[PDB]
Symmetry: C3
Subunit: 283 residues, 3 copies
Amino acid sequence: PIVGDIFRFLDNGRTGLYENYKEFSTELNMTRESNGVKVTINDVISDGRTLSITYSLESEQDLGDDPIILGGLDIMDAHGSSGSGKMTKVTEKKYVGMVTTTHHDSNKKDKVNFRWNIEGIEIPDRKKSIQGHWNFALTVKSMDSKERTIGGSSEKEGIKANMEKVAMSPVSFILYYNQEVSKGARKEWDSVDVELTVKDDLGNDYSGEGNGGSGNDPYNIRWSATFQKLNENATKLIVTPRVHLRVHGGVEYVNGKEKKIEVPNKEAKKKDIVLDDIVIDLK
Amino acid sequence: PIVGDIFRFLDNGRTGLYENYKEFSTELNMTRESNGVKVTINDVISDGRTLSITYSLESEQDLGDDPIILGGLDIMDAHGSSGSGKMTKVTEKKYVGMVTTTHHDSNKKDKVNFRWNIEGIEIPDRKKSIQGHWNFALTVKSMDSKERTIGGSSEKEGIKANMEKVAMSPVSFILYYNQEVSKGARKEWDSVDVELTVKDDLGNDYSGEGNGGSGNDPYNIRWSATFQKLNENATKLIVTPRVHLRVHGGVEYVNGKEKKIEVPNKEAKKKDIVLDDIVIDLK
Amino acid sequence: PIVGDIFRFLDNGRTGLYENYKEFSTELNMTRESNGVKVTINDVISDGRTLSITYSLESEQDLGDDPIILGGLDIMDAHGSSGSGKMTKVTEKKYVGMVTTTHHDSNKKDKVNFRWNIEGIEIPDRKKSIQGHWNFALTVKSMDSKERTIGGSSEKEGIKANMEKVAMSPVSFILYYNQEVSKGARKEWDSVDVELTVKDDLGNDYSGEGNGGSGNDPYNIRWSATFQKLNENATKLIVTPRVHLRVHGGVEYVNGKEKKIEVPNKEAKKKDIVLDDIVIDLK
């Protein structure tokens, strides 16, 4: 009850990644209640890399349209961490959502100890928050995954994508990789962002979702993304790096020398998208 | 100054619980000030079970109608914890409030070490927050209480309330207890909530307030509540468990078979309130 | 890029303090990215007393006018701490800001270990937050400063300002001090606030900014403030303590005894500003 599978309920309208999550999840339906607010933490699961959690939020009284969870899901001994969260209305007193955390410890964790510590629910519609504490402290065993360390790359505008690792669970698979930007390229561009699109030998496409990036400069970022149950008959992944370059503010028309149209800075120049292409042996 | 007794000022319009809190409180009026905002932490007190704190908030500039404290009151070595907070305007630059935290360590704590760590004041009226840090780190000695471990219960619809413990301070008293729900009952209901109402042998009623609940499933929840200075001539508590059952979304009219009115699901059925009744020896 | 020197960009319209901060800063441009939001932590610097950090915030999608950083900059082994933060729009997807934290460890710290842990970006304009994690864990070496322990004071209305310490970095200098309030004075006043204004032997004035205050009662507060690069030819600081006294709610007119105007409480009385004056040997 509420919604039967929160992972699929939340997986919209480009779709697929969460498809096998509940079945591989540990169901807990463990509850905390203060101040008219019952928080339940439903399905639980851990890549080894990323920990995803499913919850409900029920109240005595309207949360409205976009309640804000104050607090945080925290992994003990995460080295860095990144994350995401969604939430969706099912009734004006029921909400289901998902919180996701990715640690940046070099190796994956067999057991993830985490604490979900909520300190408040803001109800922006009603200008107000519900104060209190709702806490869960628990550790989860990770599903196993096969990781191979891989290489492979393509360059172009200065600006170049390196594969690092691949990891395959029963439910999903992960691509680890990073972007490098040259002194040339850094200079004409201030937001280089390298997306990968995934196919296998075989026809198929993979839906996926970033898990966050990191860097010591604004340009050389290690990233990783998670994608759909790898197809069992696939031999090879074909990876295309989409690169989205950007710099605007205001700007100029130069009706010039005549009668030709011309902007400083160059109006098509100064924020574009480019491509490349890599082959990974599932082996 | 500000308001003389924040505990009573905050205790509205069903009334009584906080009545003796200030007198048994440790007054500290310890202050922190950054960014135009002076936070004072006035009265302090600890059940052994729950820690309640009283504060003022003064600013240079309007908080408006419902300022939001970003941060948290945290008990060191709390096992779980729950809590509540209220705040009330006294001037457009003065606010008084109370924060309450309940730990779920099996035994009560003689000393409670806590940290009140504020990271911000949102001013939803003005769409804005005041960023900063205001921190108090301090430990409080608990008032003593007499706790007896008790049993006693009543069942009905599957769905059954068990007393666990009673604890009596000079200022207030606590009932520990839990609800159990059967496979039968769980199935027709998704929000069973067991409230207790308290009398003594003697006429009197007790105002009280939940301190939070906990469970490993959505149904079997350990709870506790706090109630008024127990009356000294009372011998026995008479406890009535109010049970509020719920499931709606949309719904149906069936003008049928004729001419009788009929909803799926059954429109009076599927969210009700029931009762029972228990006797506890103050002994 | 973005803005070249965030410290000066943020230093408005009484101006000077941040003027030499970037040059003495450690530039890091270390980045974290989740959920469409790239947070960069640009310039870094530490008084020994206070740690100031500069950052950018870039998004895929409007932050609007006053985004709210949920989370906190935290110093490990800070004894108490206080802080401040500003942020300013540069584009509807670019924001630059500064966060400042002051620890109240008796001695200054040669290395400050801190964690910047962001758990969310509220977008009050759009009623909404972006959930996730963006974390930086890093330690900074402090710039050296010359601290002398000093005394000196002036009294008046009961109510009296004591110098404690002075500390001079290459970029800025700090005055440590405290206010004391007598039983007389405490009684007619509930918000005594002692500001200092700074000159040297020499003509010059110093822009400065509180770093927060602390006290075990609402009145005797240790404070400190930071001011501009001390002028090299200065021999002595001339410090004037401005004292702002306050108590209003409502109030009265007494057309009386005739025809003279008279308010209870006394309408000019009950919130004023007074002064004093101290000489510190730079020695």
